[PDB]
Structures are given as C-alpha cells and as structure tokens.
Design a protein around this ligand. Sequence first.
Ligand code: CLA
Ligand SMILES: CC(=CC=C/C(C)=C/C=C/C=C(C)/C=C/C=C(C)/C=C/C1=C(C)CCCC1(C)C)/C=C/C1=C(C)CCCC1(C)C
Ligand SMILES: CC(=CC=C/C(C)=C/C=C/C=C(C)/C=C/C=C(C)/C=C/C1=C(C)CCCC1(C)C)/C=C/C1=C(C)CCCC1(C)C
Ligand SMILES: CC(=CC=C/C(C)=C/C=C/C=C(C)\C=C\C=C(C)\C=C\C1=C(C)CCCC1(C)C)/C=C/C1=C(C)CCCC1(C)C
Ligand SMILES: CCCCCCCCCCCCO[C@H]1O[C@H](CO)[C@@H](O[C@H]2O[C@H](CO)[C@@H](O)[C@H](O)[C@H]2O)[C@H](O)[C@H]1O
Ligand SMILES: CCCCCCCCCCCCO[C@H]1O[C@H](CO)[C@@H](O[C@H]2O[C@H](CO)[C@@H](O)[C@H](O)[C@H]2O)[C@H](O)[C@H]1O
Ligand SMILES: CC1=C(C/C=C(\C)CCC[C@H](C)CCC[C@@H](C)CCCC(C)C)C(=O)c2ccccc2C1=O
Ligand SMILES: OC[C@H]1O[C@](CO)(O[C@H]2O[C@H](CO)[C@@H](O)[C@H](O)[C@H]2O)[C@@H](O)[C@@H]1O
Lengths: 160, 42, 176, 730, 85
Amino acid sequence: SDPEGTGGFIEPKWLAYGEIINGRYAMLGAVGAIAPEILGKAGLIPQETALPWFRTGFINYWADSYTLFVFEMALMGFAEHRRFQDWAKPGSMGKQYFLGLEKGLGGSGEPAYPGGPFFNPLGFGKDEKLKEVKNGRLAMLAILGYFVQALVTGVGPYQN
Amino acid sequence: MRDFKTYLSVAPVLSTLWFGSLAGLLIEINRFFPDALTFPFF
Amino acid sequence: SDPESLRWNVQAELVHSRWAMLGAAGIFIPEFLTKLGILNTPSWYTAGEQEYFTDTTTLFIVELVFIGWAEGRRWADILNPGCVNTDPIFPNNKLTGTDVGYPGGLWFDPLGWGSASPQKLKELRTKEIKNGRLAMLAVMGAWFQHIYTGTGPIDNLFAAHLADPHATIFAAFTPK
Amino acid sequence: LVDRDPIKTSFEQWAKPGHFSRTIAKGPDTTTWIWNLHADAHDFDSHTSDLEEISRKVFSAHFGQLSIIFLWLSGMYFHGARFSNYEAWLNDPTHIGPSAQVVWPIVGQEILNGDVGGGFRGIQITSGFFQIWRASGITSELQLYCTAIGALVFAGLMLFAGWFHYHKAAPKLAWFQDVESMLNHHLAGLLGLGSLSWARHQVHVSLPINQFLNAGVDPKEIPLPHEFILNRDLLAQLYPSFAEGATPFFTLNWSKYADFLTFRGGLDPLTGGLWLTDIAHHHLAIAILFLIAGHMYRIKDILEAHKGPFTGQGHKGLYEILTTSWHAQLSINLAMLGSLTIVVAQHMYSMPPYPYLATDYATQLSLFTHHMWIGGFLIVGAAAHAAIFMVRDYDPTTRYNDLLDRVLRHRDAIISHLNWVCIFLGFHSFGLYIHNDTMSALGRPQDMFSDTAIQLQPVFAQWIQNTHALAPGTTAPGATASTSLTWGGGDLVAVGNKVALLPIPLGTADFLVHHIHAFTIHVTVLILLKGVLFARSSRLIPDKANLGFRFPCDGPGRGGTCQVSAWDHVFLGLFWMYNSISVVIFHFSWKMQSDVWGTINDQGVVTHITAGNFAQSSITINGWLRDFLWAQASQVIQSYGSSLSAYGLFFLGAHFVWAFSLMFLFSGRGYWQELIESIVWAHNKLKVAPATQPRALSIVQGRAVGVTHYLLGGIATTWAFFLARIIAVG
Amino acid sequence: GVIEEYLEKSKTNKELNDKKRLATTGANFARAYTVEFGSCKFPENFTGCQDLAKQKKVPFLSDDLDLECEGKDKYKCGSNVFWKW
Ligand code: CLA
Ligand SMILES: CC(=CC=C/C(C)=C/C=C/C=C(C)/C=C/C=C(C)/C=C/C1=C(C)CCCC1(C)C)/C=C/C1=C(C)CCCC1(C)C
Ligand SMILES: CC(=CC=C/C(C)=C/C=C/C=C(C)/C=C/C=C(C)/C=C/C1=C(C)CCCC1(C)C)/C=C/C1=C(C)CCCC1(C)C
Ligand SMILES: CC(=CC=C/C(C)=C/C=C/C=C(C)\C=C\C=C(C)\C=C\C1=C(C)CCCC1(C)C)/C=C/C1=C(C)CCCC1(C)C
Ligand SMILES: CCCCCCCCCCCCO[C@H]1O[C@H](CO)[C@@H](O[C@H]2O[C@H](CO)[C@@H](O)[C@H](O)[C@H]2O)[C@H](O)[C@H]1O
Ligand SMILES: CCCCCCCCCCCCO[C@H]1O[C@H](CO)[C@@H](O[C@H]2O[C@H](CO)[C@@H](O)[C@H](O)[C@H]2O)[C@H](O)[C@H]1O
Ligand SMILES: CC1=C(C/C=C(\C)CCC[C@H](C)CCC[C@@H](C)CCCC(C)C)C(=O)c2ccccc2C1=O
Ligand SMILES: OC[C@H]1O[C@](CO)(O[C@H]2O[C@H](CO)[C@@H](O)[C@H](O)[C@H]2O)[C@@H](O)[C@@H]1O
C-alpha cells in the first residue's frame, strides 16, 4: 500500500522533539570539544584562487576537503528510514547461516543503552552521593548559533 | 491491448495536444520546405 | 490519499518490459565482454573496405525487414484469437475473449490440461533476474549517461562552460 | 450525487452524465451546459447550501495565483537574464532601448526582432524590469538566473500549500469565522516586515551599488556577491558605522552629519529616478506603522458605537455578516485595491521611483495605462460582487433595520440625485467642446472658450499647485525642489539625454477634460450604483429575486422588462468605464508629450515631441483627431516591414475583433436558433448532426460575448496605437 | 572509421600517465610532504627564517598552534598592552 504520514496536533514535536535531540549532539563543538580545535568553521571557498572570511581567522584550513559529501548524507540517510521499517518487526533479521548448529552467540537484543539488556547486575558502590536531557542542549545548540556571528567588532564588549 | 471495434476514451481538450503538435509538425514541413506558393512533387 | 490510479492494462505494460529488458542483455554482456586486449585488435576488412560502404541505411531496411516481420508477429498473436467484436471483455477487447480462438477447429492449443499451461513450477528463473532486467538496465542505462555525456573535448556547445577541473567518459573505474 | 456518497469509495467520479442542479444535465443531450461548466464554475448557490467548504476552496484556489504569478516572473527574470540586453543596457543606459524577448526565425518571423542596444536582434519592452532591476546590489546575468529559480521554488511549494488545503481534509469555520486578528499580523509584519525587510536590502547593497554606479565602471568592476557583510567599511562612503551613537536616542553629536536619508525630493542629475538616499527612509518610516498598527486588537465595539440622529443606527451592527459574506468582503476591497491601483498611475509619472524613467517615456506610460485599467477593471467588479451580495449570500434576512435597510429606504433617491448631476455635467461637460466646433467652424474665436478668448488671461498658477512647489518653507524642512518636479515653482535642469518632468501648466484644455472625467466618472457609477442598489426588488419587478443576480430579462411585459437585473448594470457599466479609462489615457499622453516629453540641447531650448499643439486645439474635440488619432497613429499605419510591426499588424485585428462585438452585442437569439436549424437540417440529410443538441447562445452568454470582445477589441487597438508612438521619436 | 595500424603500434599511453613520482597534489604541498619546520628545540620565534616571522608570536600566532600554553602570557584582554601606540 501507499506509505503513511500521520499529522495529529503534535507528531510535529515528536519528530520535532527528535530533530533537536540529534542536533544536540550534532551540536558537536562543545559536546565533543576535541572535535574542533578549529573545525566548527567549514572553510568554504578559499581558493588558490582566493579568500575566506575576511578578516576571518588568520594566525580555513589545512583541511579535510572534498566531494563525496552529498553521497554520504544521502546514503546514510538511506538507513535512517530503515530502522523505521525493518523493526516494524516480523523478526528474522538474524538470517544466521543455512547449516551449523553452533550459533548460540547472540550479541545483545534490542539495545537502547548498556546493550542487550542493561547488564552485569551487581553494581553500586561509588558513582555516588523526559526532556531535560533535551531542553538543556538547545541551550547548547542555538548558543553557537549566534556565536558564529558572535562579534560587535567596531567596538566590542560594552559590559567590559 | 486494443484489437477490433473501437477503443479507450480521452479528455475535453486533447485538441490542445492536437492543435499544438500534429498541426505543429507542419511548421516542421514549413521549414524543410522553408517555402511554398506552388510545390515540386515526388 | 492514493492514486486511482490505474492498470488495467496494468497487465500489458509488463510485456514490452520483458521486451525492453531481456533485450538490454544484448548490449550489457557484449559491450563489457568486448574483449579488453583480446590478444588484440578490432579490425573489420571483409565486406567493408573495398565495395563502396556496406550499410547505414540499406542497414535498417534489411536490418529490420526482420525485426519488422518478428516484432509484429510478436504481440498480435502473442495469443489473442476470437479477434473481433462487440461487447466488453475489457483489456481493450478480450473481444477474443471467452473463446480463446477456436471451437474444435485445429490445434490452436499447446499442451494437455485444456489450456496452454507451460506447467506450474517455473516462477523461479524469470520472476527474479528478468524483471530484474527491467531493474538492472535502469541503472546501467543510467550509465549510458555517465559513460559518455561531456562530449569528450571535441565540443563545448552553448558556452556557459561553467567551471573546470578535468575530463570524463568511460572504460571502467573512477578517480575515487 | 448519489453515487456512492458514503463511505464506500475512494473510487473517484470519472464517468456518469452531469452534475450542477438537479434535473441536471439530464441523460438527454445539449450544448448550453458546456458554457455552463466554465461560466459560473466558481459561484456558490451550488456545491453545498452550507458555507464551510467555499471559504475552504477560496483560500486554496486562491493560492494557485501566487503560485502562477510565481511561474510568471520567473519567465521574465529568466528572459530578463540570458536573453540578455540587461547587462548590455546598464553600463550603457541613455543609449540602449531594451529587450528580453526574441523570436526564432520560423516562417515570416524575424521582422519582429530589430536592433535594440548592446548589439542584438529582438523585440523591445514597455514593462520596466531592467529598472526595478537597477536594484541588483550585485549585477550578473546567471544571477537573475537564481532570483529566477528562487521564483520557481516559491511555487511547487507555494502551490503545494493548495494541496495542503482543500484536498487535504481542510480547516473550518472558527478558523476564518474567528476573524478576530487577521489584519493584526498582515499590516504589522509583512506590510511591515516587507518595506521593513525591504529597507534592509535597500541601503545595505543597493544604494551603494548605484551610489558609485551613477558615474561609470563596467559591473564586477564593482559589486561582488558577498562583499556587503560585516565589512561595514564600504558603507563608509554613504555615512558612519554610527561612530559614537548607540541605537538612535539623543545624547548624540552632529558637528557634521545626520544618517543616510538626508531627505531629497527632486531628481538625480545623471539618473533622475528620484533619490535613493531617501527611498530607505520612506520605507523605514512606513513599516514602523504597520509595525505599530497591526497591533490591534482583539471587533464590533468600534462600529458598535458612533450613531446619531439621521446617521446609522445599524452602523452599530454593520454586519455580523462581515465574517459571513465574502462576496461582500470581496466587493469591498475591489473598490479599494482597484481604486488604490490607479492612484499609482499618477504618483508614478509625476514622481518616478525607479532609476531611468521619464527619459524612458514608453517604459512608464504603458505602465500608467496598464496600471489605470486595473484601477477600473477591478472597480466595476467591486460593484458586481456587491450586487452579488445585495441579491444573495446570507441564509435568511438576519441583518435587519440598519445603515442599509436605511440607504435602500431612500433608493429612488440617492440615485434620483446623481442623475441630474450627470445631465448638468455632460451639458457643461461635453457639449462644451461642441460649442467650439460649432462656433470655430462657424469661426469667430472672439467667443470660443479658448485658453485665451473666454476670460482667463496668460496665467493659471494661483491655486494649489503653486502652493505645492514652494511649500518647502512651511513646517516644511525642505530639500531643493518640491516633492514632484511638475509643480509650478522653480527648477528646470532635469536630464541629459532627453527630458523628464517640469511644471505642467493648466487653465482651460486641462480645465475641461478634467471635467469630462467628472461626468464620465459619475454616469459610470449611476448605473452601477442604481444597479447594485435595486438588486432584488422594485416597482418594475418586485418578484425580482427569484432566480439570481443575472437572469436575462424578466419578460416582454411592463413595457420593456429586459435589461434590469445587475449582471447587466455590470454589463453597461463596463461599457462606460472602457471609456472612463479609455479617455483618461487619451488625456495623459496628449498632455505628457504636447508638453513635458520633448527635449534639451544648447541653452536647453526645450523641443516637445510636440511644440504645445494642445494650446488652442484639444478644445475642439476634432483637434483630438486632427492633433491626436490622425496625427499620432501615422506611426501605426507606417509601421509595416519593421521590427515592431506586430503592432500595426495587430491594430487591424483587434481593430477587427471589436468590430465583431457588435454582432454579439446587437442581435436576437431565437435568431441564431432559427438559423442553427437550417444548418441542423442540412446536417441530418448526410446523417451528420443531432447528438449533443446544438443550441444558440444563452441570452446573457450572448452579452458575455459582447462586452468582453468589445473591450479586448477596442482596447489592444490602442495598446498597439501606443507602442508605435513612443518607440521611435518620443 | 577504417583502420590501418594498429589501433596502434604503441598502445594508449601518457594521457593518464603519472608513474615514477605520481606526484602533483601528493607532493605539492611538497613544501609539506612533511610540513617539517623548526628547531627542536627551541627558544623562540621559530617559523624561521622562512617561513617568518612572529608577527605577534607567543600564543600568537602559533595557532598555528605555537604550542603549549605557558604561564603565558596568557592572551586574554587588556594586554597585549595594545602597544599601538
Ligand atoms: C477578487 C476577484 C475576482 C474573483 C476572485 C472573482 C470571482 C468570481 N466572479 Mg467575478 N468579477 C471580478 C473580479 C473577481 N471575481 C471583476 C473585476 C469583475 C468585473 C468584470 C467581475 C464580474 C463578474 C461577473 C459578471 C460574474 C462574476 C462571477 C464570479 C464568480 C464566477 C467565477 C467563474 O466561473 O470564472 C469566470 C471566468 C470564465 C468563465 C473565463 C472566461 C474569461 C474570458 C471572458 C476571457 C477574458 C478575455 C481575455 C483577454 C481572454 C484570454 C486571452 C485570449 C484572447 C487567448 C466567482 C465567485 C459570476 C457569478 O455568477 O457569480 C457567482 C458573474 O458572472 N464576476
Ligand atoms: C577553482 C578550482 C577548483 C575546483 C574544483 C571544483 C570546485 C570542482 C567543482 C565541482 C562541482 C561540482 C561537483 C558541483 C558543484 C555544485 C555546486 C558547487 C553548487 C553550489 C550551490 C551554491 C553555491 C548555492 C546554491 C546551491 C548550489 C548547490 C547550486 C581550482 C583552483 C585551483 C587553483 C587555485 C589554481 C589552479 C589549480 C586549482 C587547484 C584548480
Ligand atoms: C519569515 C521572516 C520574514 C520575513 C520577512 C518578510 C515576510 C518580508 C515580506 C515582505 C513582503 C513584501 C515586500 C511584499 C511584496 C509584494 C509585492 C512585491 C507585490 C507587488 C505587486 C503589486 C504592487 C500588486 C500586485 C502585483 C505585484 C505582485 C507585482 C522572518 C522571520 C523571523 C523569525 C520568526 C525568526 C527570527 C528572524 C525573523 C526574520 C524575525
Ligand atoms: C482569420 C484568422 C485569424 C484572424 C485573426 C484576427 C483578424 C484577429 C485576431 C485577434 C486575436 C486577438 C486580438 C487575441 C489576442 C490577444 C492578446 C494577446 C491581447 C492581449 C492584450 C492584453 C494583455 C489586454 C488587452 C490589451 C491586449 C489586447 C494587448 C484565422 C483563420 C484560420 C483559417 C483560415 C482556418 C483555420 C483556422 C485559422 C488558421 C485561424
Ligand atoms: C517654452 C515657452 C517659454 C515659456 C516659459 C519660459 C520662462 C523661463 C525661460 C526659459 C525656461 C527654461 O529654463 C531653461 O533656461 C535656460 C534656457 O534659456 C537654460 O539655461 C542653462 O544654460 C546655460 C549653461 O550654464 C546657463 O544660461 C544657465 O546656467 C543654465 O541654467 C536652462 O537649461 C533652463 O533653466
Ligand atoms: C577540562 C580538561 C582540560 C583542563 C581541565 C582540568 C584543568 C586544566 C589543566 C590546567 C593545567 C595547568 O593550568 C592549565 O589550566 C587550564 C586547563 O588546562 C589551561 O587552559 C588551557 O586551555 C587552552 C585551550 O586552547 C589553551 O589555550 C591554553 O593552553 C590554556 O588556555 C591553562 O591555560 C593551563 O595553564
Ligand atoms: C452571432 C450570434 C450568435 C451565434 C453564435 C454562435 C452560434 C457562436 C458559437 C459557435 C461555436 C463557438 C463554434 C464551436 C464549434 C467548434 C468548437 C467545434 C470544432 C472544434 C474545433 C476543433 C474547431 C448567438 O448565438 C447569439 C446569441 C445571443 C445574442 C447574440 C448572438 C449573436 O450575435
Ligand atoms: O582514523 C580516523 C582519521 O581521522 C582521525 C581519527 O583517526 O581524526 C581526524 O582525522 C580525520 C582524517 O583522517 C578527520 O576527518 C576526522 O574526522 C578527525 O577527527 C585521524 O586520527 C585519522 O586520520
């Protein structure tokens, strides 16, 4: 049958709750701070013809370049909509191998978190003494947002 | 899929894919012979 | 809410398909086959290098006198006898319909079990790779595109141009 | 209908004769219903007796206009791009004479394609892109080629919002049937946030990128594709980066400035398109309002309020049903939208807002008559649709005893006056001219009405024009010139190719056209006014809202009983307005060229396209084909074998099509029946006719194929007459 | 077409060609096939001597990445004594 797409007060919000959750670790720059020593800046159009920003940043880059940028975001977007179909369910994913009884070996199950199950029961001594895990990382997202253009330039920190 | 004794229908103005085109192929004879006013024959 | 949307010949589109596509067979394996460096070389002197040309458009005539003949015989007795008038059995005819062809005339028929059944088993074979051939050739007919567009130097036409790195065309692989 | 209603078929209705009132298109065959179907296709007395949907259709099948205006414009930006002449024309204006369209040399074609400027074959333009396009804080041909697809973007999308309505299971009542906010929004931030946003991309980028164009260069010897960011360093030439001010307010010092704006008025010597150093300030100074303004409000309250003695008790309550009409809240609009378009048509020609207009004569009068026929074609409408109200829209009579029930109370009255108004005019408003003929052809000028014989004396001046160009000495601040250079007082020096605007003098031959307009504007309106007013009931027919606002004519009795109705008042009211506009046009160019347009050289001895021939000689209404129609038009009937030629070559057709209208306008109906059978007979003998009962035209269809033709005839006639006497000298 | 010898004598050839030193690109920044440079170590303004300079040095530039971090200085504001002038 024809594919589905139910709107209803607030799908737009479940997938809109989700969009920012992904963007909260695609926040990247300060979540994984080792990520950019200077990688937040993409480094457009600075040909051995010419130039970057403008006075920039200039004492954008060496680089990790290239092409094959569309093929990625498309091809691995050709997976985002599969853990969205496959586990509609009727399970058989573990096609195993025709012969061989020696395949008890499992791996996990369906995972969310420390894995197959949680696992290794046995725990607490010290470590010690649903959306807040969402809310605070747009309070990390939209923050670099203005920090791209984060300048007064002609002048600077009035505050100071 | 269409054999013998009339066939399937078509719209209000398929005449607008009959004025435009067919007829349209005819400018296509009015540049192959970019000219008329009598005509050689075959 | 879902298109309305069609068919019915929904039954026939599927048999210029096995036409188009099986067919692309002819181009797919013979090309690449070609035979890299056979030993080698492609040279065709024979009827061809001295008798004032060989073909092009006597090419077609002879060439598809046959295709002529055979492509016609192909769909227009695929099957369908009864072969005239006058009330509906749909395809846009089956105005063959309830009669196949003949009431006790000859051996219209192939094969016992009062039908034409080329027996029950063989979904196998041609469901798979073949309406493959439909699919396959979609993408190495999308290679036809890649394989040559770019009109190897020898012409920029309507000059945008519009930038410049380096060339393109075919033989297999890719810089990457 | 009836078909499957239910619940029980996605299976769409393709096949089974008819739909549209109920002994419908009947099994039994006919033709009338094929003009039915297209006509009244949009309507509402059928589809359903229940509002609901309709507003759910009109908010969709609306949409596909924007999207369209959007597929359109694209093929115009593309067009105004790679079919170039814009690049070529801009380094080289005063010089060029622009194109966008070009044939392909099939058959006769090519004659139409005739050297236009930056070195190429094509057909000209009187549609001032290439001049909005001055704008391009950037320039580049492939660029417009982005603005272009940027267009097709808005479209497909601003056209899948129309899937994303009606066809999608729709909003409802409240959504519009709560009106409470609508203009709140609209005027505040778009009306505002455009004009606003337009400010930001109207000094940022445009001002500078023609601040130093108004001199020379060849583009990309100027205005990069990014260049205009943070770099507030070239914004250095065109005022401070605020230097020491912070977000206006006052603790600011000017020992030498006052931000961009520094208000102009007049006209760039080198590009008299009015100054841009202003154009930001005025759009800014708009938006604010809208920005403040769209912040009402929530409705009745304000109209439920001020009444009086004779005033409007029903003022109070002026329509619950103004959330429950459309046909009403469309007709109101058209009067404004419409009447608020031809106010463009002036402020344009006596105050150009684009670089290179006036000098560009033909590329802003086309305008001033295109814009001019909407500020009229939209007004008769703005009446029609009120008639459509006045007859039907509401369910019952719940609306009662008010401003209207009032106006109607008098009605053989408001239109009783207005009438005499017109015959007072007409006699003072046209036979006025006819005097002249009868007495200038009699010939005794002593006694004409000349700008010089009947007592008026070498001055017009002392009125209000002369207190306009001179007002920069009131509460007025100032800024060299006026507001509109065409005013009485001071200044001359305007432009170095040809001319632009200068005073524009008056008296008589300006006095009386100005009055024919009155009488023309008035008797137009009489017929629409009385038309829409007497919509539903009368003492010629009271049983007279009983079908719809059309209906052919009630019937041979009562004497006449034909025209009546109000489709038809909106049929003979078009008939006038075609004049209303068609003679106002006739006015402007005969002025604007008899005086104004003309030209400088040494000692700027001015040389109008015509040494004011107007003078003593429009006053004669023959002078109007001595000096007009037979004078100019000599360019239409010379126009063969050229490049424009498509005008002269129209000017015969369409000057034919009109003279085909009368046949549709002037004739019976069981006539072409009585005829259509003789035909139908000869048809049957060969066995070739009956199926689909061929039928003559639906009394009022017939009038539909009058009128519409009479206009697309009688109109493009001049559309040709014009473009052919501004292209080429003028 | 029509062939005489031999689709070639000597086959297709130098049109992709790179071979002994397939170099260009991987190489060029054959300054820096090894962005090798200076000292090791250390004292100061390195960046030679071509390159140069040090322009404003310490943490700056070098960043680059100069290195390191120092009990400075320490950039942050106020100073450099904005020594201009
Ligand atoms: C905001 C405005 C706008 C809108 C949305 C509407 C909407 C409507 N009008 Mg309306 N109207 C308008 C402005 C508008 N009007 C104006 C300005 C006028 C004054 C002329 C009118 C005069 C008018 C009348 C008299 C009627 C309507 C009616 C209607 C309704 C019928 C619609 C229909 O079937 O299309 C009608 C369109 C056609 C059938 C297409 C034919 C168009 C022809 C004449 C071509 C025009 C010439 C052009 C140059 C030809 C193309 C080029 C060619 C040479 C290749 C509909 C609700 C009708 C009704 O009965 O109410 C329910 C009634 O007929 N209108
Ligand atoms: C300049 C160049 C380049 C390149 C390269 C390249 C470069 C290539 C390209 C390719 C392309 C492709 C593959 C595609 C693309 C597309 C695009 C880019 C687009 C974009 C856009 C925009 C911009 C916006 C809108 C959207 C779009 C998408 C349209 C070069 C340079 C140089 C120098 C210095 C010297 C010599 C050497 C070299 C090294 C050479
Ligand atoms: C979304 C937006 C916007 C905008 C802006 C806008 C939204 C603008 C607009 C404007 C508009 C305009 C500007 C209009 C125009 C119009 C036109 C142009 C038309 C014209 C015409 C006429 C005159 C009539 C008819 C015809 C035509 C059409 C031609 C934004 C938003 C936002 C948000 C939330 C977030 C943050 C940022 C912001 C920003 C705050
Ligand atoms: C005879 C004819 C034609 C004529 C024609 C004429 C003799 C005329 C016509 C006219 C048309 C028209 C005319 C249309 C149109 C149009 C337009 C496009 C318009 C536009 C405009 C506008 C926009 C608005 C207003 C202004 C104007 C008008 C400018 C034809 C005939 C024929 C024959 C033989 C047979 C077959 C068919 C044919 C081939 C057809
Ligand atoms: C057309 C019917 C005449 C009735 C109106 C005449 C009253 C005013 C006199 C002429 C009006 C036109 O105004 C025109 O005057 C002069 C022509 O003499 C021109 O004079 C211009 O040329 C010279 C060049 O430096 C100098 O004399 C002036 O500095 C300069 O303004 C101007 O380009 C224009 O300002
Ligand atoms: C958070 C993980 C790294 C540091 C967290 C734990 C304390 C940090 C170690 C400090 C080591 C001794 O003191 C140190 O404190 C800070 C944290 O390293 C350093 O912070 C450093 O981080 C910057 C990162 O670009 C560098 O420019 C400098 O080396 C310095 O700014 C001090 O400049 C350093 O002198
Ligand atoms: C001339 C005239 C007619 C006769 C006009 C007619 C019959 C015009 C209708 C002719 C139609 C449009 C011809 C349609 C035929 C073609 C569409 C069929 C072939 C399809 C094409 C491929 C040609 C009236 O019916 C009429 C009615 C009321 C008042 C005045 C008049 C009036 O003045
Ligand atoms: O093995 C990965 C590769 O990337 C590393 C991780 O190994 O880290 C940076 O370098 C790559 C280039 O290889 C960058 O694209 C990557 O995204 C960076 O984090 C580097 O050490 C390795 O070369």
